Design a protein around this ligand. Structure first.
Ligand SMILES: [Ca+2]
Length: 279
């Protein structure tokens, strides 16, 4: 399948060179996989989700995304026009309030909730969790991400936006999950992206068009935007049978475009997520 005039990040993950505008992908498109987006919520009624999104848990007064961030991330995972895995099932867990903030105890509870709730859902091709959030180092937050990964869920987390070593941030610094940096459309490390030895992979993160609240769209930037490209790619590859939740991050690194990014500090991987599609 081919989507013409796609957002640049979708084109980039299906190409070995920058500057293309078509997203090439297998028609299975993540069908039969499930992705939990742990964030400010998801506007499930947005037409771009086609009925495939549902809120399953909130830690605040409403399950509504009053911010937009969670709806943007979910759109990069799985919306029709803006998504990597266009037929996956999206589940929203609201651990962040409508200003985008949340306490660590609530974020940990939301991770432990997903590890249990996936056992009540029909996800025959596997389960992914996308965490476009973080803050300063906390061994407890890291331990919650490690538990979620151990339970059989592919965990992708944002590296953070401080132009610093991600070892000082959580859950970015948990080694067992998949920590995602950001790149721009000229194959530079995004100027805000964290870096360091804990990073596993880069994905597109600057000027990313996706869904927004009020049935709208908008373009924003962050490692929060790179993480759902990798979470969606994992769901897509699991549905194709190429990998499992336990080994998807390593499979994505092994099959990445290698050495194409500029402005990568020595000691950080130079790997850009790539779907290896061949018509
Ligand atoms: Ca890792």
């Amino acid at each position: 399948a081919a989507q013409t005039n796609a957002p640049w990040g979708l084109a980039r993950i299906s190409s070995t060179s920058p500057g293309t505008s078509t997203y090439y992908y297998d028609e299975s498109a993540g069908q039969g996989s499930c992705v939990y987006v742990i964030d400010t919520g998801i506007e499930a009624s947005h037409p771009e989700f086609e009925g495939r999104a549902q809120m399953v848990k909130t830690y605040y007064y409403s399950s509504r995304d009053g911010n937009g961030h969670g709806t943007h991330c979910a759109g990069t995972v799985g919306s029709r026009t803006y998504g990597v895995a266009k037929k996956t099932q999206l589940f929203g867990v609201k651990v962040l309030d409508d200003n985008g903030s949340g306490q660590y105890s609530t974020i940990i509870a939301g991770m432990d909730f997903v590890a249990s709730d996936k056992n009540n859902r029909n996800c025959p091709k596997g389960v992914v969790a996308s965490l476009s959030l973080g803050g300063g180092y906390s061994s407890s937050v890291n331990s919650a991400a490690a538990r979620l990964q151990s339970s059989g869920v592919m965990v992708a987390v944002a590296a953070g936006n401080n132009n610093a070593d991600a070892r000082n941030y959580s859950p970015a610094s948990e080694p067992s999950v998949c920590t995602v940096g950001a790149s721009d459309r000229y194959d530079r490390r995004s100027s805000f992206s964290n870096y360091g030895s804990v990073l596993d992979i880069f994905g597109p993160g600057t000027d990313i068009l996706s869904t927004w609240i009020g049935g709208s769209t908008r373009s924003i930037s962050g490692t929060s935007m790179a993480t759902p490209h990798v979470a969606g790619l994992a769901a897509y590859l699991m549905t194709l049978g190429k990998t499992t939740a336990a080994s998807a991050c390593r499979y994505i690194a092994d099959t990445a475009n290698k050495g194409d990014l500029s402005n990568i500090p020595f000691g950080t991987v130079n790997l850009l997520a790539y779907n290896n599609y061949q018509a």
